[PDB]
């Protein structure tokens, strides 16, 4: 039981808030920055987690973006698929099914985001899904 | 422990049966209408949850279909991706990766279903995946 | 609590190792053969679970591959979406969002893998995602 607040922080000092439950064996963690809402009987708003070029390790292979993180938990999560929008520097954009994991390198957490080839360089990825990882410890 | 039966009901009085577990903090809920089966060593049958135009709020922006619901639980779920089939009025159809959440507007549960542009108007979405949401309460 | 080791075995005696937790009602199971790693600040390696033509039931309808299994647990899981790579006999390959379930036929576990049409016959599917199923018992 009850759901404890947490956060990561990115290179550019962006703060990714989450809630979790540790039950151990079991860690279940949800990002809470971008919970979509219905405004109007014609309109649902997706909110985004906005990650910029500066939050990624340069350089990138295989459209795999590594977002090194500080604080929060060190888990090897499963892969979850998400709704992405990838924003090129030329400001065209592509909707994609992305795939996200949490992983631990050195002493540190990282988010892995994997998407499809885009015809340009990337200024921003936005995650438009509400993300929850169910993790197994050890 | 053990798994309690529940249901929602749609505008057109369709009944979406599920099982759940509340452990609280934690709510884990599975839709049980469409559990696929192997009939024959050559054949697996996906079953569908069939949602019609009449179950959605008209009008729809961004290929986002809001299915207002009565009964069952009020949760803000994460987004899950699913296998959809979208059936146009002209009866062509498209397989898609859709994304589904549960959300709460006013006092009421809603299912959000988000898919890709189709070249026509929609008569039916069928969800062909077995859907389970792991939710965090509060 | 704590996470118990398990495995399935395929027709070709491939061994698919997993960890699980049974809490019952609740079974949460993770495949552990292919946990990706960061080697270098430019490189994350996806690992694959490699399933071959011989692990599937011939013949296949609807790009649905049935992998009959021995040992481990008998669950009807939800569908999870994954990163696939499908390798044709002509050795071209396609990245896809696949969908995987566990299911039980006769007395036996099966993995279901569902992907998109490919322009040829398949030698191998590789699952490149880290797969975790949260299951409800009964």
Author numbering:
A (entry chain A), B (entry chain A), C (entry chain A): 317 to 454
Show sentences the authors wrote.
The fibre protein interacts with the host cell through its distal, carboxy-terminal, head or knob domain.
The model was also independently refined against data collected from crystals of the native, non-selenomethionine-containing avirulent and virulent forms, and here manual adjustment resulted in a model containing the same 138 residues plus ordered solvent. The structures of avirulent and virulent forms are virtually identical (root mean squared difference (r.m.s.d.) of 0.53 Å when the C-alpha atoms of residues 317–454 are superposed). The largest difference is in the C'C"-loop, which moves upwards by up to 3 Å. This loop is near the two residues that differ between the avirulent and virulent forms, i.e. near residue 354 located in the C'-strand (Met in the avirulent form and Ile in the virulent form), but also near in space to residue 376 in the C"D-loop of a neighbouring monomer, which is Met in the avirulent form and Thr in the virulent form. The different position of the C'C"-loop can perhaps at least in part be attributed to the side chain of residue Ile354, which appears to push it further away. The melting temperatures of both the virulent and avirulent forms of the protein are 80°C at pH 6, which indicates the protein is very stable. The thermodynamic parameters derived from curve fitting suggested slightly different ways of interaction for the avirulent and virulent forms of the TAdV-3 fibre head protein, since both the enthalpic and the entropic contributions of sugar binding differ. The lower enthalpic stabilization of the complex in the virulent form is partially compensated by a more favourable entropic contribution. Both proteins bound 3'-sialyllactose with two- to four-fold higher affinity than 6'-sialyllactose, while the avirulent form of the protein bound sialyllactose more strongly than the virulent form (1.5- to 3-fold). In crystals of the virulent variant soaked with either of the two sialyllactoses, some positive electron difference density was also obtained, but not convincing enough to allow modelling.
